[PDB]
Write a protein that holds these residues in place. Structure first.
Motif, mmCIF file in Angstrom:
data_model
loop_
_atom_site.group_PDB
_atom_site.id
_atom_site.type_symbol
_atom_site.label_atom_id
_atom_site.label_comp_id
_atom_site.label_asym_id
_atom_site.label_seq_id
_atom_site.Cartn_x
_atom_site.Cartn_y
_atom_site.Cartn_z
ATOM 1 N N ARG A 45 -107.743 -26.973 8.834
ATOM 2 C CA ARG A 45 -108.776 -26.358 9.698
ATOM 3 C C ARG A 45 -110.102 -26.399 8.946
ATOM 4 O O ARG A 45 -110.136 -26.067 7.794
ATOM 5 C CB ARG A 45 -108.414 -24.904 9.994
ATOM 6 C CG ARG A 45 -109.188 -24.309 11.159
ATOM 7 C CD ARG A 45 -108.548 -24.792 12.428
ATOM 8 N NE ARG A 45 -109.235 -24.571 13.690
ATOM 9 C CZ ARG A 45 -108.900 -23.617 14.538
ATOM 10 N NH1 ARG A 45 -107.944 -22.777 14.209
ATOM 11 N NH2 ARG A 45 -109.510 -23.503 15.689
ATOM 12 N N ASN A 46 -111.126 -26.784 9.685
ATOM 13 C CA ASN A 46 -112.497 -26.841 9.154
ATOM 14 C C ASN A 46 -113.189 -25.525 9.481
ATOM 15 O O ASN A 46 -112.812 -24.895 10.397
ATOM 16 C CB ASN A 46 -113.267 -27.953 9.852
ATOM 17 C CG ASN A 46 -112.694 -29.286 9.475
ATOM 18 O OD1 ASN A 46 -112.404 -29.435 8.324
ATOM 19 N ND2 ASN A 46 -112.496 -30.187 10.408
ATOM 20 N N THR A 47 -114.260 -25.236 8.762
ATOM 21 C CA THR A 47 -115.010 -23.979 8.983
ATOM 22 C C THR A 47 -115.576 -23.899 10.401
ATOM 23 O O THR A 47 -115.661 -22.825 10.899
ATOM 24 C CB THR A 47 -116.043 -23.781 7.876
ATOM 25 O OG1 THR A 47 -116.821 -24.959 7.770
ATOM 26 C CG2 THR A 47 -115.384 -23.619 6.532
ATOM 27 N N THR A 51 -110.201 -29.268 13.477
ATOM 28 C CA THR A 51 -109.040 -29.489 12.596
ATOM 29 C C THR A 51 -109.000 -30.969 12.249
ATOM 30 O O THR A 51 -109.310 -31.765 13.079
ATOM 31 C CB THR A 51 -107.755 -29.023 13.292
ATOM 32 O OG1 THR A 51 -107.895 -27.641 13.600
ATOM 33 C CG2 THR A 51 -106.510 -29.161 12.429
ATOM 34 N N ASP A 52 -108.619 -31.262 11.015
ATOM 35 C CA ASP A 52 -108.407 -32.642 10.552
ATOM 36 C C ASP A 52 -106.887 -32.899 10.633
ATOM 37 O O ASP A 52 -106.063 -32.081 10.188
ATOM 38 C CB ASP A 52 -108.838 -32.779 9.112
ATOM 39 C CG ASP A 52 -110.272 -32.503 8.940
ATOM 40 O OD1 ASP A 52 -111.099 -32.695 9.858
ATOM 41 O OD2 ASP A 52 -110.547 -32.069 7.807
ATOM 42 N N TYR A 53 -106.577 -34.121 11.035
ATOM 43 C CA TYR A 53 -105.177 -34.470 11.315
ATOM 44 C C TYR A 53 -104.790 -35.794 10.678
ATOM 45 O O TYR A 53 -105.434 -36.762 10.776
ATOM 46 C CB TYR A 53 -104.974 -34.655 12.815
ATOM 47 C CG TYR A 53 -105.145 -33.386 13.601
ATOM 48 C CD1 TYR A 53 -106.386 -33.002 14.073
ATOM 49 C CD2 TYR A 53 -104.058 -32.596 13.906
ATOM 50 C CE1 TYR A 53 -106.542 -31.840 14.793
ATOM 51 C CE2 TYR A 53 -104.202 -31.430 14.629
ATOM 52 C CZ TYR A 53 -105.447 -31.068 15.092
ATOM 53 O OH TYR A 53 -105.598 -29.937 15.798
ATOM 54 N N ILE A 58 -108.383 -37.090 10.297
ATOM 55 C CA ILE A 58 -109.336 -37.358 11.405
ATOM 56 C C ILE A 58 -109.602 -36.050 12.154
ATOM 57 O O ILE A 58 -108.708 -35.353 12.489
ATOM 58 C CB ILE A 58 -108.768 -38.493 12.247
ATOM 59 C CG1 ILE A 58 -108.828 -39.794 11.443
ATOM 60 C CG2 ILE A 58 -109.547 -38.612 13.545
ATOM 61 C CD1 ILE A 58 -108.114 -40.924 12.075
ATOM 62 N N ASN A 59 -110.876 -35.774 12.332
ATOM 63 C CA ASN A 59 -111.398 -34.485 12.832
ATOM 64 C C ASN A 59 -111.426 -34.440 14.365
ATOM 65 O O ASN A 59 -111.871 -35.347 14.973
ATOM 66 C CB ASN A 59 -112.809 -34.367 12.259
ATOM 67 C CG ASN A 59 -113.462 -33.009 12.220
ATOM 68 O OD1 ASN A 59 -114.406 -32.807 11.481
ATOM 69 N ND2 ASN A 59 -113.028 -32.093 13.019
ATOM 70 N N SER A 60 -110.954 -33.329 14.899
ATOM 71 C CA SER A 60 -110.943 -33.030 16.342
ATOM 72 C C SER A 60 -112.370 -32.792 16.861
ATOM 73 O O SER A 60 -112.495 -32.725 18.050
ATOM 74 C CB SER A 60 -110.092 -31.830 16.611
ATOM 75 O OG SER A 60 -110.650 -30.685 16.015
HETATM 76 O O LIG Z 1 -113.309 -32.327 7.847
#
Ligand SMILES: [O]
Ligand SMILES: [Cl-]
Ligand SMILES: [Cl-]
Ligand SMILES: [Cl-]
Ligand SMILES: [Cl-]
Ligand code: NA
Ligand SMILES: [O]
Ligand SMILES: [O]
Ligand SMILES: [V+3]
Ligand SMILES: [V+3]
Ligand SMILES: [V+3]
Length: 129
Positions: A45-47, A51-53, A58-60
């Motif tokens: 989870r990013n601030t 979310t990166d997956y 790779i970022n949502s």
């Molecule tokens: O990220």
């Protein structure tokens, strides 16, 4: 799936990342090592609430749909869950769009900070690809 270093190098090469947009295979393996430790199931989870997956984190915010990232895009037209598969096809196809987006591999902050300018060929050294 947690790939071995050479196993992921071979898969990334089979999927067309070797020299994709000029980035040698070692760049991609290095980025995967620092983004996910070669674990396809990695999620962070990013601030900003995105979310990166996956193996390439790779970022949502831009690339996939997770249904929980307000105002985001899905530029790779995929469920972020597809980026967690043991099969790296979705992650590779989406990474190809990301790396073509203008900043190259600088899109991966871990690549910029930990791989860029380094001896990335060391990541594929000794591998039967
Ligand atoms: O990220
Ligand atoms: Cl390389
Ligand atoms: Cl991240
Ligand atoms: Cl969303
Ligand atoms: Cl570039
Ligand atoms: Na999204
Ligand atoms: O491969
Ligand atoms: O694949
Ligand atoms: V992040
Ligand atoms: V497949
Ligand atoms: V091969």
């Amino acid at each position: 799936k947690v790939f071995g270093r050479c196993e992921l190098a071979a898969a990334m090469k089979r999927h067309g990342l070797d020299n994709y947009r000029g980035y040698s295979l070692g760049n991609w393996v290095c980025a995967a090592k620092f983004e996910s430790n070669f674990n396809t199931q990695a999620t962070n989870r990013n601030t900003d609430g995105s979310t990166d997956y996956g193996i390439l984190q790779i970022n949502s915010r831009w690339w996939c749909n997770d249904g929980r990232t307000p105002g985001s895009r899905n530029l790779c037209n995929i469920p972020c869950s597809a980026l967690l598969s043991s099969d790296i096809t979705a992650s590779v196809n989406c990474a190809k769009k990301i790396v073509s987006d203008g900043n190259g591999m600088n899109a991966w902050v871990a690549w910029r900070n930990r791989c860029k300018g380094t001896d990335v060929q060391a990541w594929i050294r000794g591998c039967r690809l």
